[PDB]
Design an enzyme around this catalytic site. Structure first.
Site, PDB file in Angstrom:
ATOM      1  N   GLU A  41       0.837  -1.196   0.000  1.00 21.75           N
ATOM      2  CA  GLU A  41       0.000   0.000   0.000  1.00 21.75           C
ATOM      3  C   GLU A  41       0.873   1.248   0.000  1.00 21.75           C
ATOM      4  O   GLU A  41       1.852   1.331   0.743  1.00 21.75           O
ATOM      5  CB  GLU A  41      -1.008  -0.010   1.144  1.00 21.75           C
ATOM      6  N   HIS A  42       0.501   2.222  -0.843  1.00 23.59           N
ATOM      7  CA  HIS A  42       1.211   3.479  -1.000  1.00 23.59           C
ATOM      8  C   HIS A  42       2.651   3.245  -1.458  1.00 23.59           C
ATOM      9  O   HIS A  42       3.550   4.023  -1.127  1.00 23.59           O
ATOM     10  CB  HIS A  42       1.065   4.369   0.250  1.00 23.59           C
ATOM     11  N   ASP A  85      -3.972   0.538  -9.960  1.00 20.66           N
ATOM     12  CA  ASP A  85      -5.375   0.160 -10.101  1.00 20.66           C
ATOM     13  C   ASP A  85      -5.691  -0.091 -11.571  1.00 20.66           C
ATOM     14  O   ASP A  85      -6.422  -1.020 -11.892  1.00 20.66           O
ATOM     15  CB  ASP A  85      -6.355   1.158  -9.464  1.00 20.66           C
TER      16      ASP A  85
HETATM   17  O1  LIG Z   1      -1.932   1.791  -2.176  1.00 21.35           O
HETATM   18  C1  LIG Z   1      -2.445   3.125  -2.375  1.00 21.35           C
HETATM   19  C2  LIG Z   1      -3.292   3.175  -3.664  1.00 21.35           C
HETATM   20  O2  LIG Z   1      -4.275   4.200  -3.576  1.00 21.35           O
HETATM   21  C3  LIG Z   1      -5.071   3.896  -4.716  1.00 21.35           C
HETATM   22  O3  LIG Z   1      -6.446   3.930  -4.426  1.00 21.35           O
HETATM   23  C4  LIG Z   1      -4.503   4.649  -5.905  1.00 21.35           C
HETATM   24  O4  LIG Z   1      -5.437   4.683  -6.981  1.00 21.35           O
HETATM   25  C5  LIG Z   1      -3.316   3.723  -6.221  1.00 21.35           C
HETATM   26  O5  LIG Z   1      -2.500   4.309  -7.252  1.00 21.35           O
HETATM   27  C6  LIG Z   1      -2.478   3.458  -4.935  1.00 21.35           C
HETATM   28  O6  LIG Z   1      -1.634   4.604  -4.691  1.00 21.35           O
END
Ligand SMILES: OC[C@H]1O[C@@H](O)[C@H](O)[C@@H](O)[C@H]1O
Ligand SMILES: O=C1CCCC2=C1C1(CCCCC1)N=C(Nc1nc3ccccc3o1)N2
Length: 391
Positions: free
Chosen positions: A42-43, A185
């Protein structure tokens, strides 16, 4: 119960009926692109990191037909879409570009049209339907962008690569929806495959399709049914911070920064920046370990990393919220749950729980009874990415 079933056949049928009623003839084609859950990582995507998403059977379907008049005519039947549920516009030209505005849902379609790489693109009529909960953390917008892109490919084949297609959809997100997302995504929506997770290297753009087909394993997605304000405003802040740490360290991205390096160069960066970067650099390592764990069928390690991912997101990255923290705590206390964590951007949306399949129905009674808000559940098989059906 709170369990939403996919109803895939029904979605397509709904789209077809609405098209015929709206436009006075049968549509010539159907496409779909799925939403997604991020298992871990994530992130990391915008930090040139690693991500491990899977596609869902929740999806956006476009059904439509080319036109001869160079104009685009849309209807959406998605309850949740902003008003109006219809929009028409001429195709962009060298003379006149499309611009974002009202309604918001159409901005995703317009953006993809605007940046579509191949010519000549004809006009078209289309109905848009989706089973992805709109703004609910499972990438409804990427599904719409990718479904649009897939439709345009039928109208005017591109000669392009998957990364290029993801970049177009990403650009539409940035420029037309003002959300400076990473590539994850769009990538999973394009590239998902039934019975697989997708490990994405966001530096090299290498992808691996990792089998995820053990029927003793289940992925339970829980929708908190909240989205806090900070969701929109804070995402670019975190992204802006990460960039500052890379700058200070003379690293092209955080991916090039190793955890050992980070602890030793701390004086050169701010206290809060250090905590954000510790999440990121840390999360990249966990994602690599998690992928390896998945391959070996070592769910306890995967789950430990997943709970670990939540804690890091909660404390270091600060993108959780009480609702997410509570949904995780509830899940994490159930025997047979390996891991649970927020998924997606945070500040609301969904959690993902990796657990023994037989324990799933225990979760749904208990989460509903022991969550402050309204939980919605998806029990999700790993699904296909973008698909076409000629009608
Ligand atoms: O893991 C965090 C994610 O947040 C999403 O919803 C965003 O569209 C992705 O690019 C990614 O940064
Ligand atoms: O307001 C927000 C906050 C930011 C995230 C986000 C939204 C809205 C945008 C316009 C309508 C209201 C919700 N929509 C999406 N995604 C989306 N809208 C769709 C319409 C039809 C089919 C698939 C769709 O996916 N994402």
């Amino acid at each position: 119960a709170a369990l939403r079933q996919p109803q895939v056949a029904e979605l397509l049928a709904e789209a077809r009926r609405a098209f015929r009623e709206e436009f006075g003839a049968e549509p010539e084609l159907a496409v779909s692109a799925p939403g997604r859950v991020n298992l871990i990582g994530e992130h990391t995507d915008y930090n040139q990191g690693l991500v491990l998403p899977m596609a869902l059977e929740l999806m956006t379907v476009l059904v439509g037909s080319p036109r001869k008049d160079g104009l685009v005519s849309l209807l959406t039947t998605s309850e949740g879409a902003d008003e109006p549920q219809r929009l028409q516009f001429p195709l962009p030209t060298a003379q006149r570009s499309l611009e974002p505005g009202t309604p918001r849902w159409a901005n995703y379609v317009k953006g993809v049209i605007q940046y579509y790489p191949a010519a000549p693109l004809p006009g078209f009529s289309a109905v848009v339907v989706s089973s992805v909960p709109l703004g609910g953390g499972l990438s409804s917008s990427a599904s719409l962008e990718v479904a649009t892109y897939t439709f345009l490919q039928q109208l005017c084949p591109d000669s392009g690569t998957i990364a290029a297609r993801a970049q177009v959809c990403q650009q539409a997100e940035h420029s037309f929806a003002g959300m400076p997302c990473g590539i994850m995504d769009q990538f999973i929506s394009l590239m998902g495959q039934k019975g697989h997770a997708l490990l994405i290297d966001c530096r090299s753009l290498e992808t691996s399709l990792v089998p995820l087909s053990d029927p003793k394993l289940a992925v339970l997605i829980t929708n908190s049914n909240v989205r806090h304000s900070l969701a929109s405003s804070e995402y670019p802040v975190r992204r802006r911070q990460c960039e500052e740490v890379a700058r200070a360290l003379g690293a092209a991205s955080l991916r090039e920064v190793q955890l050992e390096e980070l602890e030793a160069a701390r004086d050169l960066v701010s206290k809060e920046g250090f905590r954000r970067a510790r999440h990121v650099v840390g999360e990249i390592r966990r994602t690599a370990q998690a992928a390896a764990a998945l391959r070996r069928g070592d769910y306890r390690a995967f789950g430990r990393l997943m709970v670990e991912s939540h804690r890091s997101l909660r404390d270091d990255y600060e993108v959780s919220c009480p609702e997410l923290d509570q949904l995780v705590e509830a899940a994490l206390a159930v025997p047979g749950v390996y891991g649970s964590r927020m998924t997606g951007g945070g500040f609301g949306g969904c959690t993902v729980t990796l657990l023994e399949a037989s324990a799933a129905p225990h979760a749904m009674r208990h989460i509903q009874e022991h969550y402050g808000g309204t939980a919605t559940f998806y029990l999700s098989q790993a699904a296909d990415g973008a698909k076409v059906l000629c009608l």
